[PDB]
């Protein structure tokens, strides 16, 4: 959307702060097993990182997932001061299954709040089209935010950021290649 450039790495690490209206995009075709986690981390303030926010999606198509979790997604917020968990909350997102294709598109409208558009193509009925819901992550932009996925076997993971965003593209520890 607009001028998105692929980030040749495994996650999107922003240099500095996100100005308003730039975007980062994380896409995949699904995952193999377990929970899908979309993360936003920030630098801890020795040079380590801490979660700022997390979206965890439980597949409706894996036997044994609790009935109160299966096919649901949850937003976990963390304190931007002591890295403490503030709260968890169910959020309405179109990702229902680990066989769905999906995209996360995150931006800050005013340089302060972070929100993401979450797109999914439901595998269990891929004959409907794409669906999208927007989620406010309920945290504020900090310098040097990182965005990515943590999951067992994400299929065809690709990453993009706005042209005007400074994204790390040469750190071998981020799988940059």
Are 56 and 36 contacting, i.e. CB atoms less than 8 angstroms apart?
Answer: yes
Burial of 150 (0-12, 13-18, 19+ CB in 10 A): middle
Delimit the domains of the chain by residue range: 1-177
* Listed resolution, Å: 1.8
Q: In degrees, to the nearest 5, what angle opens at C-alpha 33 toward C-alphas 29 and 39?
A: 65
Residue 174 phi, psi (nearest 5): -90, 15
Whole-Å CA distances, 47 to 44, 65, 81: 6, 36, 15
Are 168 and 15 contacting, i.e. CB atoms less than 8 angstroms apart?
Answer: yes
- Say which residues have a Cβ less than 8 Å from residue 13's Cβ, sequence separation at least 6: 144, 145, 146, 167, 168, 171, 174
Which technique? X-ray
Sheet containing 33-43: order of strands: 12-13, 146-152, 33-43, 49-57, 73-78, 85-91
Are 132 and 5 contacting, i.e. CB atoms less than 8 angstroms apart?
Answer: no
Q: In degrees, to the nearest 5, what angle opens at C-alpha 6 toward C-alphas 23 and 17?
A: 35
Token duo for residue 161:
């950021």
Token duo for residue 108:
């800050």
CB atoms closer than 10 angstroms to residue 84: 10
Question: Which DSSP helix (H) or strand (E) runs through 166?
Answer: none
């Amino acid at each position: 959307f607009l001028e998105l450039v692929e980030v040749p790495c495994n996650s999107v690490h922003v240099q500095g702060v996100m100005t308003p209206n730039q975007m980062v995009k994380v896409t995949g075709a699904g995952w193999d097993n377990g929970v899908l986690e979309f993360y936003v981390t920030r630098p801890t303030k020795d040079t380590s990182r801490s979660h700022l926010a997390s979206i965890m999606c439980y597949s409706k198509d894996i036997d044994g997932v609790p009935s109160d979790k299966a096919g649901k997604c949850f937003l976990k917020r963390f304190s931007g001061e002591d890295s403490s968990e503030i709260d968890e909350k169910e959020v309405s997102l179109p990702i229902k299954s680990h066989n769905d294709a999906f995209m996360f598109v995150c931006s800050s409208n005013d340089g302060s709040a972070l929100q993401c558009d979450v797109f999914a193509l439901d595998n269990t009925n891929s004959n409907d089209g794409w669906k999208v819901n927007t989620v406010d992550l309920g945290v504020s932009v900090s310098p040097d935010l990182a965005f990515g996925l943590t999951a067992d076997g994400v299929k065809v993971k690709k990453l993009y950021a706005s042209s005007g965003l400074t994204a790390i593209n040469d750190d071998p520890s981020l799988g940059c290649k």
